[PDB]
Structure formats: structure tokens, C-alpha cells
One Martini backbone bead per residue (centre of mass of N, CA, C, O) as a GRO file, in nm:
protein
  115
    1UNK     BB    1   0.107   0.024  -0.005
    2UNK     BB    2   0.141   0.329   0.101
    3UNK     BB    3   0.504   0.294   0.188
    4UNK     BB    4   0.425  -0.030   0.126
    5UNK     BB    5   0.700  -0.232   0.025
    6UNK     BB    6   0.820  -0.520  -0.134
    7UNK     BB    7   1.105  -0.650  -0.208
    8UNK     BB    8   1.295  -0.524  -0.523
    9UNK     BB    9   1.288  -0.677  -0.783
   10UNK     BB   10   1.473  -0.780  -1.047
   11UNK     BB   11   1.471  -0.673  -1.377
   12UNK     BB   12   1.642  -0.579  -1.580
   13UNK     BB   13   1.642  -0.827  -1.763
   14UNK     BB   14   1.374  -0.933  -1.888
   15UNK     BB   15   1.375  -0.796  -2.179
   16UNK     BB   16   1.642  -1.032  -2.251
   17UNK     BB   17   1.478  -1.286  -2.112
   18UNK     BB   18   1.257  -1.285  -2.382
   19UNK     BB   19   1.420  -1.267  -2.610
   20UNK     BB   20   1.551  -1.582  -2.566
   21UNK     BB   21   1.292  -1.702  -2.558
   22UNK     BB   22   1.193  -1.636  -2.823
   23UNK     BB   23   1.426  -1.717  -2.982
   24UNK     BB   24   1.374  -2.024  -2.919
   25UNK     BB   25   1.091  -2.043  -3.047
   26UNK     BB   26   1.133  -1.953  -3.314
   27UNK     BB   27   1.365  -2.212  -3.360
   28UNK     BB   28   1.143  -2.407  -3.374
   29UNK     BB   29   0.992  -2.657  -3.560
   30UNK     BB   30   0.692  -2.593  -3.455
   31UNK     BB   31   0.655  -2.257  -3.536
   32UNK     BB   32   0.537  -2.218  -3.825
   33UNK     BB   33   0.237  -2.116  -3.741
   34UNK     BB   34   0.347  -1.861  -3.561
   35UNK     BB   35   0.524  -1.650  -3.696
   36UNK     BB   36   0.296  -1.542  -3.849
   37UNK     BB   37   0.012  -1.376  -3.939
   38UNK     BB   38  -0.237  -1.466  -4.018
   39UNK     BB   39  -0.471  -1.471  -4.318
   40UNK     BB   40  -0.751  -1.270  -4.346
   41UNK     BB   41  -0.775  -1.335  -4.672
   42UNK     BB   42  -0.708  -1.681  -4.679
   43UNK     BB   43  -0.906  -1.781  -4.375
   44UNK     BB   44  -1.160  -1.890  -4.315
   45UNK     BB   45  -1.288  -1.710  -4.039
   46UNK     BB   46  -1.070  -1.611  -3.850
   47UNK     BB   47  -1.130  -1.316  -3.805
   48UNK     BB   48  -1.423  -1.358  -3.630
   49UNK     BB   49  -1.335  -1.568  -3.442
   50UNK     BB   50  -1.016  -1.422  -3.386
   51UNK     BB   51  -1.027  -1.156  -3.176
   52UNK     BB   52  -0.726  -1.202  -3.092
   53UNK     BB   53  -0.400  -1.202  -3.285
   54UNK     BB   54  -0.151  -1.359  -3.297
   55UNK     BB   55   0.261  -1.381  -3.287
   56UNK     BB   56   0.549  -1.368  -3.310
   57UNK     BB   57   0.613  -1.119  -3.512
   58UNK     BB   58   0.452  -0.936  -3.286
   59UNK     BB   59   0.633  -0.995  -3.023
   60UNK     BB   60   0.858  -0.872  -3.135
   61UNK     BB   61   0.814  -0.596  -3.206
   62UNK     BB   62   0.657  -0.526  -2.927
   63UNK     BB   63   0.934  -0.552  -2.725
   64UNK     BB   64   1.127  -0.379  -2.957
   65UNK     BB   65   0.929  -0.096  -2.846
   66UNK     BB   66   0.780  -0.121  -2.571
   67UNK     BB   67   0.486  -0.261  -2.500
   68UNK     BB   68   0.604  -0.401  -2.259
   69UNK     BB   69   0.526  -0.321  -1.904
   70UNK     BB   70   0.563  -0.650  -1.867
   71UNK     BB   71   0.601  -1.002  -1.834
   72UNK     BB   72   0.315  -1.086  -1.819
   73UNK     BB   73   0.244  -0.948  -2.117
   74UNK     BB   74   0.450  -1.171  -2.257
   75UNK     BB   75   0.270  -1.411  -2.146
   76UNK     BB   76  -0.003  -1.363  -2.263
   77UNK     BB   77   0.070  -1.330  -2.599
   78UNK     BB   78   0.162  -1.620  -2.597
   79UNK     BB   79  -0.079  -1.768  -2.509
   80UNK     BB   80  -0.247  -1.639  -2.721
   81UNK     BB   81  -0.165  -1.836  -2.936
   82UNK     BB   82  -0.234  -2.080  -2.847
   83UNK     BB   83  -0.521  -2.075  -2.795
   84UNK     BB   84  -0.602  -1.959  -3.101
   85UNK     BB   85  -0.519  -2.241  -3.196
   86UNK     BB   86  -0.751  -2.423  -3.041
   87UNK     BB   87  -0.995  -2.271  -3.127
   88UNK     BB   88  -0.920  -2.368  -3.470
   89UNK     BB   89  -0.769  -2.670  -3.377
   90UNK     BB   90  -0.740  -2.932  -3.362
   91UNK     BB   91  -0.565  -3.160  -3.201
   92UNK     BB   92  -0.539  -3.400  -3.468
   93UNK     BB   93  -0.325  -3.186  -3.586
   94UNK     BB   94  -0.032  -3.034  -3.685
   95UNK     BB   95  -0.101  -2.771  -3.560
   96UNK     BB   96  -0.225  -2.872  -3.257
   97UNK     BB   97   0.048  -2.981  -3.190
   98UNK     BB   98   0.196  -2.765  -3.188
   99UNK     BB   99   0.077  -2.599  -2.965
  100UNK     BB  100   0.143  -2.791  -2.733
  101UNK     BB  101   0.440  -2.799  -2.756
  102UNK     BB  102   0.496  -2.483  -2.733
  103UNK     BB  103   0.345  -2.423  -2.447
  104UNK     BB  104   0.528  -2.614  -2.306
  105UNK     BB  105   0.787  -2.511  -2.360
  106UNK     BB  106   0.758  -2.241  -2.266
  107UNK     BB  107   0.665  -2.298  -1.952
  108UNK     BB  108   0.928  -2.383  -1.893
  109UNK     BB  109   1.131  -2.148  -1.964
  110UNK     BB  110   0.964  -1.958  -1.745
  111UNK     BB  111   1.024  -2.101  -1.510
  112UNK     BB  112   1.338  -2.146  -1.515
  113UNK     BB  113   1.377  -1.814  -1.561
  114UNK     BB  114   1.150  -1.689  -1.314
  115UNK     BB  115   1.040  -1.942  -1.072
   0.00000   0.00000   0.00000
């Protein structure tokens, strides 16, 4: 509360140690599906359905120009990648096998990064 905080955490890392992350992402060979943005006037249903659109290379944008506030805000649109893989395809095809596989992957090097 006012004048009363929790000792200072230090965040200064966490700008290049999410940028690491991500970079392990991109590099997966899992990552195809999530590379670029869904191409929403080549893919019927996609822009309708999928309120909130991520990718890859648009949370590397927004990373590399500051528009994540804290990392909380940057595990939100990893994860709502994959949500919205989930939303999409089928569990047994092989874009829905791989965001399982990558929020996997994800949720490891988050937890070992930073928990």
C-alpha cells in the first residue's frame, strides 16, 4: 500500500532474458504455424472467430519497441497464441499438435527463467 512495499525485485534482465525466450520460440522447428499473422483474408472464419490475432514476429515487434509493460504482459500474448491455435484447430492435426507442443515448451523455459 502507500509508503509499504514488498522487497524490490530485480525486472532488469527480464527485457533481454523474454527476448531469449522468444528467440528459443522462433527457433523451434515446431514454430511454423505461429511464425507470421494468420493471413486473414486467405483463411475463412479465421478473422471473425479470432478476436485477439497473435504471432510470433508481432510479439517480437512489440517487445523490440516497448510496448510490453512487464513480463506478465509478454507470457499473455505467448499464451494467447496458442489459446487461439486451441480455438482453431483440431487437437489431432498437426498445427494443433504443435501449439501444444510449444506452450509446453513455453511454460518450461518460463518457469525455469523466472520461478
Amino acid at each position: 500500500s502507500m509508503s509499504v512495499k514488498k522487497p524490490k525485485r530485480d525486472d532488469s534482465k527480464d527485457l533481454a532474458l523474454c527476448s531469449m525466450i522468444l528467440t528459443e520460440m522462433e527457433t523451434h522447428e515446431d514454430a511454423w504455424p505461429f511464425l507470421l499473422p494468420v493471413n486473414l483474408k486467405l483463411v475463412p472464419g479465421y478473422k471473425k472467430v479470432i478476436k485477439k490475432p497473435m504471432d510470433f514476429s508481432t510479439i517480437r515487434e512489440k517487445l523490440s519497441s516497448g510496448q510490453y509493460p512487464n513480463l506478465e504482459t509478454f507470457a499473455l500474448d505467448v499464451r494467447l497464441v496458442f489459446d487461439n491455435c486451441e480455438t482453431f484447430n483440431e487437437d489431432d492435426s498437426d498445427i494443433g499438435r504443435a501449439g501444444h507442443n510449444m506452450r509446453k515448451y513455453f511454460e518450461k523455459k518460463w518457469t525455469d527463467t523466472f520461478k
